Design a protein around this ligand. Structure first.
Ligand SMILES: O=C(c1cc(Cc2n[nH]c(=O)c3ccccc23)ccc1F)N1CCN(C(=O)C2CC2)CC1
Length: 340
């Protein structure tokens, strides 16, 4: 019988939930009979990202309708679906890139799982992350809760958020890998929301950069690690419904350095000299006059006020780093979503 405290055991259950893995696949219209959870592989996915990279290049550089259709036919061969939309544009590509991002982390969670002691303690060790419950009445839980209420956007009014549990986390080797940037200026505690089915992958391997095979054109600001300073922007990425109105969000200390400010899409491979991050400018920004500090990290917990900028693609800000060593995962929050 496991010694871990109940909110932790309950977190481990959610993360390694094989049912939620299948649900998330069927939501991306995958053919479970032609390709179930067990038949999913890292290199199949990586090859499917490569076909998408080839699709985007064929659309860009003038290629025959016959060519793109063959590249498309191969994607659907490699990843069987059951609905066959032609992958001939940036939109069709982004939708498949978003699905593979989920498949890659689902296959990570199923590889660990299917690879003496209580099975919960075993699965917790495969995470290679120390997890502690943060006491509700601490300074840490004071700051983390205010950040939530304030930075929830007015337009994402469809639900209200309620904090269930706050976990302090520590990935093995992350502080040592972080050491080079531990010095950098502009250090912000930012939100990163993802489906619960991706958390085994995020804790075991940390937040990564998409595989080399993934098209840089498949992400608005290219192949980086993305954060928001507005809780609801990241909480929307939890994709909580009603069969599961409980999602997980991360808080990571991010080494922003010099921010390359952008208003629109920029499919960036590497940053220009003199820059360490990208800041996508939102129409609404959390007030810089209500900012606070926590353990050497700046917290933009200010309320949502106009940034001035109007000619932008983004309603709200977002932050991108292009080195995995620029992020320090600090907290995992378990949230309750209350829909209208
Ligand atoms: O950080 C993102 C990412 C997330 C999103 C959606 C998103 N998800 N979550 C957020 O909190 C967020 C905040 C601001 C802007 C977007 C987001 C979009 C493009 C991205 F490149 N990654 C997706 C691609 N990466 C992978 O490891 C994929 C799984 C193989 C690197 C991590």
């Amino acid at each position: 019988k496991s010694k871990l405290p109940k909110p932790v055991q309950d977190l481990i259950k959610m993360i390694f939930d094989v049912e939620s893995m299948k649900k998330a696949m069927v939501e991306y219209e995958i053919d479970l009979q032609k390709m179930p959870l067990g038949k999913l592989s890292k290199r199949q996915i990586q090859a499917a990202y490569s076909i998408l990279s080839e699709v985007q290049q064929a659309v860009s550089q003038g290629s025959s309708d016959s060519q793109i259709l063959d590249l498309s036919n191969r994607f659907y061969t490699l990843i069987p679906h059951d609905f066959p939309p032609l992958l001939n544009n940036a939109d069709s590509v982004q939708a498949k890139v978003e699905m593979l991002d989920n498949l890659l982390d689902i296959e990570v969670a199923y590889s660990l799982l299917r690879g003496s002691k209580d099975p919960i303690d075993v699965n917790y060790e495969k995470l290679k992350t120390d997890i502690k419950v943060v006491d509700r009445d601490s300074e840490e839980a004071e700051i983390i809760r205010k950040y939530v209420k304030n930075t929830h956007a007015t337009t994402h009014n469809a639900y209200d958020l309620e904090v269930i549990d706050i976990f302090k986390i520590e990935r093995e080797g992350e502080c040592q890998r972080y050491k080079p940037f531990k010095q950098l200026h502009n250090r912000r505690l930012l939100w990163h929301g993802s489906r619960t089915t991706n958390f085994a992958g995020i804790l075991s391997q940390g937040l990564r950069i998409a595989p080399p095979e993934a098209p840089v054109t498949g992400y608005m600001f290219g192949k980086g690690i993305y954060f928001a300073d507005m809780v609801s922007k990241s909480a929307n990425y939890c994709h909580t419904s009603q069969g599961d109105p409980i999602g997980l969000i991360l808080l990571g200390e991010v080494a922003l350095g010099n921010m390359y400010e952008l208003k629109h899409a920029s499919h960036i491979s590497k940053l220009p000299k003199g820059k360490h991050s990208v800041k996508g400018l939102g129409k609404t920004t959390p007030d810089p006059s209500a900012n606070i500090s926590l353990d050497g990290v700046d917290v933009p917990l200010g309320t949502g006020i106009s940034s001035g900028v109007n000619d932008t693609s983004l309603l709200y800000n977002e932050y991108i780093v292009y080195d995995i060593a620029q992020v320090n995962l600090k907290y995992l929050l378990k949230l309750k979503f209350n829909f209208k």
